[PDB]
Swiss-Prot record, chains A, B:
Name of the featured protein: Precorrin-8X methylmutase
Keywords attached to this entry: Cobalamin biosynthesis, Isomerase
Presence of keyword Isomerase: yes
Organismal lineage: Bacteria, Pseudomonadati, Pseudomonadota, Alphaproteobacteria, Hyphomicrobiales
Assembly with partners or alone: Homodimer.
Gene: cobH
Catalytic residues in the record: 42
Length: 209, 209
């Protein structure tokens, strides 16, 4: 029983992107956004997810500029942070997730909110000009909107891609309604997740293969 | 602008599982398998993914027994390993991923295969009786089948859930055709991925919320 498969790593990424291009409806995206689209599709294995992707007008430019500028990537979840291929980052960008910071549970408890949300209080210094990747927790997304509403400094771009059935769609909708002036990208509805978010970051970091 | 959302972490998991139960077709799974199904759906946000889940007859029993027995979870990718909520493991089960072991690139090069695949040569001692979680790399799955064919000791269960467009479906199909006598669980077609795989592991570790 001889298994026949591509044993070549690069050949695998190459055929996979060739395949996603050949099956994915990418016409409504800019060339640049399509790049994110493909990697994102690469990451979830679902070519149809593209129908749910929404990139505000200057989302990739501003988020790519921020990253090239050295802007940190604030992540709501470690998984997102783990999916970020560092060798791809342009400027030794930091990938911060404070979800696991020891003060997070304490904060979540004092504020009456989730750990994912409360963690964002620990973003303070870094919020300004950052690229926010919210790949998992909707409450982190709503919380970021409350901080923005209440005068918090603004991120250069917000990847609003929490996945889920509770608050995921609405938080992303709230983002799209008024992101307080910050370019955004969302995956509509319940889809999203850290793999797709990290893919998105990966492509933002460096377009193409 | 008052954002109204559940600020309660447990309430969020609670409503999400209640929602997945209410929308997900779970009838063809056993009660036990449905548990995996829900968490898996929880993880990708897609209730329809359940249509692609396949649990061999004794997959959950043997994989849950293995884990309760203290069996390690061999993972093809770190992401899978990161999604495994340790506090859930039953018996201080080890979660091994050797994808990043320094000898992996070397091996991939000598064998003429991917790093994900070659890494599995480093599984040797642990393979027997383990629970294999292949959440990302199809070549790791094919390679595991070649090791099994060629006399390698058998895992107690194999989660064959690599996601992808190249080799993902076929490797999972090969698994289902002849897993060399090992219970398996696959996510048919291109869907799969580390979040869903880890969810699967999480549920195997401890059923329910």
């Amino acid at each position: 029983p001889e298994y026949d498969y591509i044993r070549d790593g690069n050949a695998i990424y190459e055929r996979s992107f060739a395949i996603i291009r050949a099956e994915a409806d990418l016409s409504r995206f800019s060339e640049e956004e399509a790049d994110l689209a493909v990697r994102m599709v690469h990451a979830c294995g679902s070519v149809e997810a593209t129908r749910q992707f929404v990139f505000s007008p200057d989302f990739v430019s501003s988020a790519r500029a921020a990253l090239k500028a050295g802007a940190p990537i604030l992540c709501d979840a470690e998984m997102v942070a783990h999916g970020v291929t560092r060798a791809r980052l342009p400027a030794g960008n930091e990938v911060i997730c404070t979800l696991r910071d020891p003060r997070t549970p304490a904060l979540a408890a004092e504020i009456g909110n989730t750990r994912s949300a409360a963690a964002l209080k620990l973003w303070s210094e870094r919020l300004a000009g950052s690229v926010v990747a919210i790949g998992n927790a909707p409450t982190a997304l709503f919380f970021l909107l409350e901080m923005l509403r209440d005068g918090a400094p603004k991120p250069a771009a917000i990847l609003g891609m929490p996945v889920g059935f509770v608050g995921a769609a609405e938080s992303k909708d709230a983002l799209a309604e008024n992101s307080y002036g910050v370019p955004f990208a969302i995956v509509r509805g319940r889809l999203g997740g850290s793999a797709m978010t990290a893919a998105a970051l990966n492509s933002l970091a460096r377009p193409g293969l």
